[PDB]
Every structure is written in C-alpha cells, then in structure tokens.
Design an enzyme around this catalytic site. Structure first.
Site, PDB file in Angstrom:
ATOM      1  CB  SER A   5       0.273 -12.183  -3.282  1.00 19.38           C
ATOM      2  OG  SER A   5       1.247 -11.237  -3.712  1.00 19.38           O
TER       3      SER A   5
HETATM    4  C1  LIG Z   1       0.657 -10.100  -4.139  1.00 15.15           C
HETATM    5  O1  LIG Z   1      -0.467  -9.962  -4.585  1.00 15.15           O
HETATM    6  N1  LIG Z   1       1.652  -9.049  -4.341  1.00 15.15           N
HETATM    7  C2  LIG Z   1       3.024  -9.083  -3.826  1.00 15.15           C
HETATM    8  C3  LIG Z   1       3.075  -7.966  -2.717  1.00 15.15           C
HETATM    9  N2  LIG Z   1       2.159  -8.000  -1.591  1.00 15.15           N
HETATM   10  O2  LIG Z   1       0.860  -7.972  -1.959  1.00 15.15           O
HETATM   11  S1  LIG Z   1      -0.071  -8.459  -0.867  1.00 15.15           S
HETATM   12  O3  LIG Z   1       0.289  -7.915   0.490  1.00 15.15           O
HETATM   13  O4  LIG Z   1      -1.488  -8.035  -1.288  1.00 15.15           O
HETATM   14  O5  LIG Z   1      -0.107  -9.958  -0.887  1.00 15.15           O
HETATM   15  C4  LIG Z   1       2.886  -6.674  -3.480  1.00 15.15           C
HETATM   16  C5  LIG Z   1       1.562  -6.671  -4.238  1.00 15.15           C
HETATM   17  C6  LIG Z   1       1.229  -7.899  -5.085  1.00 15.15           C
HETATM   18  C7  LIG Z   1       1.857  -8.008  -6.484  1.00 15.15           C
HETATM   19  N3  LIG Z   1       1.121  -7.546  -7.627  1.00 15.15           N
HETATM   20  O6  LIG Z   1       2.930  -8.553  -6.672  1.00 15.15           O
END
Ligand SMILES: *C(=O)N1C[C@H](NOS(=O)(=O)O)CC[C@H]1C(N)=O
Length: 246
Positions: A52
C-alpha cells in the site's frame, strides 16, 4: 534484489530491541544536516514489495496525467462487496488513503498506460522498476523497493525534485497527514504484504516536518507473521518519540 549505494550514515544499532521478533530496518534522513541514520544497514538496502505504500506514487502519477484534479478526486464504488466495509462506499483521495482502499488505486493504475508507468518509475528511480509480474504488480509481486529508497523518494518529492505539480504533492501530503500541531506536521503511510496467509512484510514510511527541518523515515519488517503496517507504525512512533520528533 538490493539497492546499491555508498552513502555514509550514522549507525543506530541500539534500536535493535524495538525489532524483537523481526528482521527489520529503520532509516532516517535529516534534511538540514543532509545526513542518514540507519538501523540494520543490510536490511535497509534489501528491496521488498511496497504494497500500500505505492499508493502515494500512483496518486501523483494520476494527478500528473489528469485522472485526478486538485478539486476532483471522487470515485464511485461499483458495489463489489469487499470484506472491509470502509471500502464499500464512494471515496475521494483523503478517504482512499486513510482507509487504504485498494480498488481506488487499482482504478488509477488501470487508466495509466503501463509504458507511462515504466517511464515514471524510471524517472523517480522506484526500486527495481519491475512491473511485469502481475496486474497488481505492487502487491507482493515483481515491484520491490528498499527502505533507504523509500526515504529518498519522499525527500525528492517534498524537495520538489520530481516532475510533479507542487499543488498535487500538497494534496497527496494532506491525504497522508496523521497529526498537525503548531510545532510539527506528521505524515505517513502503512503497507502490509501477505505471504502464505500470514503478514510477512510491513512498512511505515513518511516524514516529520518541524519549523526548521524535515525528518524522513522508513521502517520495514520482515517476519513469518505479524509483520504488518500497524506494527511498523507502532515501532516507528516509539523511535520517533525517543528522538523527540513527535
Ligand atoms: C496495503 O498494503 N494494503 C491494503 C490494506 N491496508 O493495508 S495497510 O493498512 O497496511 O496499508 C490491506 C493490506 C494491504 C494489501 N496487501 O492490500
């Protein structure tokens, strides 16, 4: 796999206790002093999927290509039921960053030519620049970046060394602003990567802007499990508070 640089740095090896249970790194860049400080220099150069944290630069590319406008960042939800109810609603830039809404940024990527994406990643020197592994190449796929590179890109962004509009940068900064006081603005973004159904890759990257300096940072966690953005942010905040930055 690894970012090559010979820059000098101050060793922060006594940050090790904060990383109990993980192979981790913390990178700090002090803008006024033009100085890096690093815990775990080998891990600071190892490239990992950004997950993300890539949303920062997808947002900037989208502004630069006029998919988003300074006053027009809304996207309509297409009614797909995601497991996170925060995602099951219309979004703007601020809400999509706050709730880390994957579909908002997937839509941006879908409307960018992948040749343009390659050109952007070349220009901003985004890690290995490898985007061929999967449609969502930034989610535990081919694209990988190191902690020191995450810091370098944030500093190049804020120092206006990238070819993005300054007002677009302000909008993206605002969307990742976590706390604003008279004495400092605290900006950051989490990321988490899932491998074998476990949290195996955690990021927290950002900066603290004070009245006379800017302190850019990146924390990475590698582990079999529990290596997630929330933990990377918790560790970061412990370190930054001990530095009296927040
Ligand atoms: C980003 O890494 N993502 C989208 C969402 N939130 O994650 S975060 O709060 O660490 O930014 C879920 C996890 C992750 C993903 N693999 O999509």
């Amino acid at each position: 796999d690894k970012y090559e640089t010979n820059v000098s740095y101050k060793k922060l090896n006594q940050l090790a206790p904060y990383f109990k249970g993980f192979d981790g790194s913390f990178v700090l860049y002090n803008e006024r002093e033009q100085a890096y400080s690093i815990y775990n220099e080998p891990e600071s150069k190892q490239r990992y999927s950004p997950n993300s944290t890539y949303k920062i630069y997808l947002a900037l590319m989208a502004f630069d290509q006029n998919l988003l406008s300074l006053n027009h960042t809304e996207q309509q939800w297409d009614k797909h039921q995601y497991p996170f109810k925060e995602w099951n609603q219309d979004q703007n830039l601020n809400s999509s960053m706050k709730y880390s809404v994957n579909w908002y940024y997937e839509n941006l990527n879908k409307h960018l030519r992948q040749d343009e994406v390659k050109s952007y990643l070349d220009l901003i020197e985004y890690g290995n620049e490898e985007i061929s592994g999967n449609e969502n190449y930034w989610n535990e796929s081919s694209l990988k970046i190191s902690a020191i590179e995450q810091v370098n890109l944030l500093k190049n962004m804020k120092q206006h060394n990238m070819h993005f509009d300054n007002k677009a940068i302000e909008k993206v900064e605002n969307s990742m602003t976590l706390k604003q006081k008279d004495t400092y603005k605290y900006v950051g973004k989490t990321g988490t990567g899932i491998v074998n159904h476990k949290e195996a890759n955690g990021w927290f990257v950002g900066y603290v802007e004070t009245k006379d300096n800017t302190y850019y940072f990146a924390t990475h966690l590698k582990g079999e499990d529990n290596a997630n953005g929330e933990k990377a942010q918790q560790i970061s905040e412990r370190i930054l508070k001990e530095m009296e930055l927040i």
